Amino acid sequence: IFVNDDRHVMAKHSSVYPTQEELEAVQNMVSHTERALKAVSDWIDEQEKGRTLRGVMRVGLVAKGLLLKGDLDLELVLLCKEKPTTALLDKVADNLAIQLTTVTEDKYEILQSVDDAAIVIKNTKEPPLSLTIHLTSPVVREEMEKVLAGETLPPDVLDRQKCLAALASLRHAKWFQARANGLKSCVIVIRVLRDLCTRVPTWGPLRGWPLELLCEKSIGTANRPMGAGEALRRVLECLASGIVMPDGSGIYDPCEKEATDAIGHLDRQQREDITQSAQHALRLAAFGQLHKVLGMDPLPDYTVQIPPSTTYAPMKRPM
C-alpha cells in the first residue's frame, strides 16, 4: 500500500538519521559516563562500608533511539536510595571527574547544576556533545504522592519538581521500549515527524513526548502492520480528525497516575493551527504530493541506534 510513500518516507528518513561518526561518538561518551558512574558508585559503597546510588538508566533520545543528524543533547538518570541532596551532587561530580580516568583519556568538562538537580558533561569534539545526568529518587515521588493526598510526613534537598520530572522521563523511556519500539514503523515515523516539528514552527509544540504518544496511539490502533508510508498517513488522518482540538479527547498520558493530557499546554490557536496544517498535509499526501510535506523533491532493524548498556544492562511489543 502506497509504495512511493514508503520510498519517500524512508528516503527522508536516511537524510535525518545520525552519522556512523555521530553515533560512534555518542556510544563512547555514554559508555564512558556509565562505566564512570558505576565506578563512582562502588567507590561510595566501599567508602561507606568502613546501595546509596541505585543505578544509572538511559532516557530520552538515547534510550528511545530517536537521535537525528545534528543532535548534541544526551541524557541519563541517576537513581538514589534517598532524596538527592546538594551534598551528594558534589560528591558524585568530583568523583566522576576522577573515575573517568579509569576508562578513558578523553577530556570531559564537568559542571553541576544544583538548580537543575543534575550534572552536565561535555566532550571536546566540534561541536561538543552534552550529556546530562539527572539525579532523583523514587522517594521523591512517594512523598509527593503523600503530599497531594494531604498526608503527614536533610537541609539541602534538590528541587523536587525537577526530580519528579526525571522519574517521569525514566517512565517514558520504559514505556517507549515496551509500547513503541516493537510497533512497526512507529520509530521511523517518529524521527521523520520529529524533523517536521523542527522545520515547521507550527508543529513545534508537538515535539517530544506528545508526538511520540500520538504516533504510537495512531499507528498502534491500526488493525494490521503498516509500512512507513501508510503509517505516517494514519498519523495525519488522526490529527486531521481534530484529535487535538480543545473539545477533543486530548492525549492521555500513560505514565501519570492523575489523569493528564500530554498536549494540555497547547493553547487554542496552536491547536487550531496544527489541525489545519495536518488536515492539509493529509490531502497532499493523499493526492501524491507527500514529498511536499516531508520537505524533499520527488525521487526519480532501523530501531537500534546504539547497543544497550553492558554496565547497567528488554521487554518488547508482543509479535
Binding site: A259, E272, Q289
Partner: protein
C-alpha cells in the same frame, strides 16, 4: 485496503482526560433544526394520499391487466418517502415499476395515461397533472407529486436496443433504487439514522463543497456514522453528526482509502469513486473546515440557524479570538 482514522472505531485507545463537555444546546438545536426540516402534517397526508391512490391502481393493473397492452411485473416504493427521510418543501415520492416487456417511450406514455385516467375517474373533483419524462412519468396534485421510475426485467436488459427502448442507464438506476430501498429498510431504519440523513441533505445544500455527494452516498454515510461501531449500539445524534465531519476530514472518501463499500453492488465497489479527484479533495477540505469550526462552538451557524454560512468555508473567520483559516485546494490537475 486502507482504512482512514476513525476515533469511534478505537475509542478505547483515547481515554478521556476530563468529562465530556455539556453538549445539551448542540443536541437540542440538532432536533430543533430537524423539526424545521421535517414535513408538516399536511404534506404527509398529501403524499400519503396520492401515493396510496396510485400504488393501488398499479397493483390492480398487475393482477387483472384486462384488455390492457402493457404488462407490468411489479411495483416497489423507493426513495425518501419509503426511507423516511423526506424534507419539508419537497413533497415528492418515488415508485419503481417493472415492465415485463421492453420499455419504450410509447409504452411509458400509454401507462402514465391509464393510471392518471383511472385516478380522474375515481375522483373527477381532484385536479391532477400527468407528464412524462426521461425516467418514466409523473403525476402531481396541487399539494404533492409522485415520480414513477419505469424499468424492466433483467433478461430484457441484455435484449434492449438504444433506438426504441429507454437508456440502459435509466433502466438500471431504477433497478438499483429498488436495492437501495430494500437495504435501507433492512439496515438503516433507525430513528437517529433517518434524522441524520435529513440533516446531511441540508448541510450539503448550504455548503456548495458537499455538492458532489449523491443521495445514496448520504444514506450510506449517515448509516456508518450512527451504526458502524464495535459496540452494537446507535450513536447519539450529536456524536454521529460530528463524526460525519470527522470521518470525511480524515479522508474517508479520499484516494487510497477503502471508504465505504456499496452493499447493493458487486463485488467491492467504493461508493465515492463516482466523484472526481478534484471533488474528493473538495468534499474533504470542506468537511475539514467545518470540523474545526464545530470545535470552536459554531453549531448554530453550521446548522443553518444563523443565516447564510457558506462563506465560513472560503473566508477567514474569527471565533472568540482564534483565527480560523479554511482548508484549501491540494489537488493538482494534469
Amino acid at each position: 485496503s486502507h482504512i482512514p482514522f476513525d476515533f469511534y472505531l478505537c475509542e478505547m485507545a483515547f481515554p478521556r482526560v476530563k468529562p465530556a463537555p455539556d453538549e445539551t444546546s448542540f443536541s437540542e438545536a440538532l432536533l430543533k433544526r430537524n423539526q424545521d426540516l421535517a414535513p408538516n402534517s399536511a404534506e404527509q397526508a398529501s403524499i400519503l394520499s396520492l401515493v396510496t391512490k396510485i400504488n393501488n391502481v398499479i397493483d390492480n393493473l398487475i393482477v387483472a391487466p384486462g384488455t390492457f397492452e402493457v404488462q407490468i411485473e411489479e411495483v416497489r416504493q423507493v426513495g425518501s418517502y419509503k426511507k423516511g427521510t423526506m424534507t419539508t418543501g419537497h413533497n415528492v415520492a418515488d415508485l419503481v415499476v417493472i415492465l415485463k416487456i421492453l420499455p419504450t417511450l410509447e409504452a411509458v406514455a400509454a401507462l402514465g395515461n391509464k393510471v392518471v385516467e383511472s385516478l380522474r375517474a375515481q375522483d373527477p373533483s381532484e385536479v391532477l397533472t400527468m407528464l412524462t419524462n426521461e425516467t418514466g412519468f409523473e403525476i402531481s396534485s396541487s399539494d404533492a407529486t409522485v415520480k414513477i421510475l419505469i424499468t424492466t426485467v433483467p433478461p430484457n436488459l441484455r435484449k434492449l436496443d438504444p433506438e426504441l427502448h429507454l437508456d440502459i442507464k435509466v433502466l438500471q438506476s431504477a433497478l438499483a433504487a429498488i436495492r437501495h430501498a430494500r437495504w435501507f429498510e433492512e439496515n438503516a431504519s433507525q430513528s437517529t439514522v433517518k434524522v441524520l440523513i435529513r440533516l446531511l441533505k441540508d448541510l450539503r445544500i448550504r455548503f456548495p463543497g458537499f455538492e458532489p455527494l449523491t443521495p445514496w452516498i448520504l444514506d450510506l454515510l449517515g448509516h456508518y456514522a450512527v451504526m458502524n461501531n464495535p459496540t452494537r449500539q446507535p450513536l447519539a445524534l450529536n456524536v454521529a453528526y460530528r463524526r460525519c465531519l470527522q470521518i470525511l476530514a480524515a479522508g474517508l472518501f479520499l484516494p487510497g482509502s477503502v471508504g465505504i463499500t456499496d452493499p447493493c453492488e458487486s463485488g467491492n465497489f467504493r461508493v465515492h469513486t463516482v466523484m472526481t479527484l478534484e471533488q474528493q479533495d473538495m468534499v474533504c477540505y470542506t468537511a475539514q473546515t467545518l470540523v474545526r469550526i464545530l470545535s470552536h462552538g459554531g453549531f448554530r451557524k453550521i446548522l443553518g440557524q444563523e443565516g447564510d454560512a457558506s462563506y465560513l468555508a472560503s473566508e477567514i473567520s474569527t471565533w472568540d479570538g482564534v483565527i480560523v483559516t479554511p482548508s484549501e485546494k491540494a489537488y493538482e490537475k494534469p
